[PDB]
Homo-oligomer: A and B are copies of this chain.
């Protein structure tokens, strides 16, 4: 086996196809860095990265290659870093073997046993923090026979980011672990920032070309409903596996997962890669462009065209004139009818459509001496819950009704509804009577 140096490429670029009918020893040299970068216009963030970029450098090897993996951590790094590649068969995917303090180096070796497109990421405590700061990338293990040649290959990885400040707030934004743990992202992006791959930084192709996208999802947390606006995937390698799906509009990419999608571009214009959990795209930044140049094909698409729609919208909260006014019951008939709504929405699942309950389990509200003898017991049952021995129409019950957080109006109305149905005692209970039971 001859040794070769891996050619690593920054996103959105991909190394050339392997030019070997046989195995080699591949030497990889990757460094870990911590540095400030732009996350959106006017907003900065300390990105942690494999090789200077988020996602990290793309690695391309052949199934069966013997890999020497060298990780070096810059001395300016404050944290140790390591690597788990999903392409590795071995403990921690390399994590135990690549633990690298600032200024130091580690080396491990592995054979690439499985072809596919694999996420790699840092595996240093706090793991979610390292990953959330941008420490992820892709390694392609080509099948022995190689992949079909295509005209354009691009590398993108989606990530969710969590900042102390809100989206768009100017300044150097720190990581917010409270948001990250809650899975509540401020930014969702391809390739490390809002607008990383739009306008002059767009992916490019020409009419008639085949395009392949190597799409990863570094997470840490979110699952991508991955879609290209104005295109349909001719082929999807399902979850990056061997299975090929065709004619797919939108595919799910797991957190810590990847997929390969392919399509021929037949019409010129801008095609927009998004996470179709759609506020992530137009509000949080999960929007990249593929700009296709060449002659119109009016047999495929013809219409007015102007790049004045599908622009980024930001994350400010937009509101229309509010239409809501509180409604309260004014008389007994109205309490009964409002109460029926409360009953059917909240009580019926147990006590049933005609108040009959389920014998031995949920007692009847229909002709209930328990309720009729003191309607405030029905009020208390809702507010406080009801458990333990009770008697309803001389039948013993011993179940548990949960407390339910209904307001005074709803309780007053539902109890009034029940009292005026199913041969119960009639009368009514008011919201103020309920308030005083609290």
Contacts and interface: CB of A to CB of B under 8 A. Distances in A.
A316 B404 contact: yes
Interface in A314-353: 314-327, 338, 341, 344-346, 348-350, 352
A223 interface: yes
Contacts of A245: 238-239, 241-243
Q: Which of A99, A128, A341 gathers most chain B CB within 10 Å? A: A128
B232 A309 contact: no
Interface stretch (A106-114, A373-381, A422-430): A106-114
Interface residues on chain A, size class: 35 or more
A126 B318 contact: yes
A294 interface: no
Contacts of A309: 82, 92, 95-96, 99, 123-125
A255 B229 contact: no
Given A111-B300, A181-B315, 5 more contacts: A78-B400, A96-B308, A107-B303, A127-B281, A177-B318
A305 interface: yes
B361 A101 contact: yes
A118 B254 contact: no
A317 B181 contact: yes
Contact of A238 (B238, B269, B319, B322): B238
Secondary structure call for the A interface: loop
Given A242-B247, A277-B220, A345-B40, A164 B282 contact: no
B243 A304 contact: no
A204 B338 CA distance: 31
A90 interface: yes
Contacts of A84: 229-230
Contact of A249 (B104, B168, B240): B240
